[PDB]
């Protein structure tokens, strides 16, 4: 489903993402924005290494979730990749919290580095009453 901005902000707030490992909600919002445009159905296959990125956070099938067809898959979230294409994002959030427990944190998503790091990201949460 495609979330509306403030609708997603409050959902992430309820699921405990604000300040999780020091990451504000505005930073998770900037990440979902640029990864999928807040769309839970988004997939991106990467023909060079044969992995696919799934859901609102574009979590990759080599390290985090298992789709059965990715070479050298780790499945660190212990989650089927199809759990990340659901309209309910609770599973995508539990796996996103696993990704940032690694030392790189949110820097693991290069799109965050390109689009959100060292920028004013508070316009993503503004007006949502969060």
Q: Which domains does the chain have, with CATH numbers?
A: 1-130 (1.10.530.10)
Question: In terms of Cα–Cα distance, which of 22, 26, 1, 30 is closest to 13?
Answer: 26
Per the CB < 8 A criterion, the answer to whether 11 and 3 are in contact is: yes
Task: Give the CA count within 13 Å in the CB-facing half-sphere of 74.
Answer: 8
Q: In whole angstroms, what is the distance from residue 71 CA to residue 15 CA? A: 32
Bridge partners, residue 20, by sequence: 23
Structure-token match 């998770």, residue found: 28
Q: In whole angstroms, what is the distance from residue 126 CA to residue 26 CA? A: 9
Angle among Cα 74, 57, 38 to the nearest 5 degrees reads 160
Active-site choice (53, 67, 91, 102): 53
Active site residue 102: no
Q: In whole angstroms, what is the distance from residue 60 CA to residue 67 CA? A: 10
Per the CB < 8 A criterion, the answer to whether 85 and 41 are in contact is: yes
Please give the C-alpha separations between residue 29 and each of 22, 32, 104, in angstroms, as whole numbers.
14, 5, 18
**Consecutive H or E run containing 60:** strand 59-60
C-alpha of 92 from chain center: 7
Active site residue 67: no
Q: Which two tokens stand for residue 32?
A: 């979902």
Q: Note the resolution in Å, 1 decimal.
A: 1.8
Q: In whole angstroms, what is the distance from residue 2 CA to residue 41 CA? A: 8
The sign of the torsion formed by the CA atoms of 116, 24, 5, 107 equals: positive
Q: In whole angstroms, what is the distance from residue 122 CA to residue 128 CA? A: 11
Q: Residue 4 burial (CB < 10 Å; 0-12/13-18/19+)?
A: exposed
Q: What spatial distance separates the first Cα and last Cα of the chain, rounded to whole Å? A: 21
Question: In terms of Cα–Cα distance, which of 63, 53, 50 is closest to 102?
Answer: 63
Active-site choice (4, 7, 18, 35): 35
Residues in the chain: 130
């Amino acid at each position: 489903k495609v979330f509306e901005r403030c609708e997603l902000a409050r959902t992430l707030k309820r699921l405990g993402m604000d300040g999780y490992r020091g990451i504000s909600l505005a930073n998770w919002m900037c990440l979902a924005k640029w990864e999928s445009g807040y769309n839970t159905r988004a997939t991106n296959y990467n023909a060079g290494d044969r992995s696919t990125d799934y859901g609102i956070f574009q979590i990759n099938s080599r390290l985090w979730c298992n789709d059965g067809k990715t070479p050298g898959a780790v499945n660190a979230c212990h989650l089927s990749c199809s759990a990340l294409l659901q309209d309910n994002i609770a599973d995508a959030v539990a796996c996103a919290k696993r990704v940032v427990r690694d030392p790189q944190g949110i820097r693991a998503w290069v799109a965050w580095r390109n689009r959100c790091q060292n920028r004013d990201v508070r316009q993503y949460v503004q007006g949502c009453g969060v």
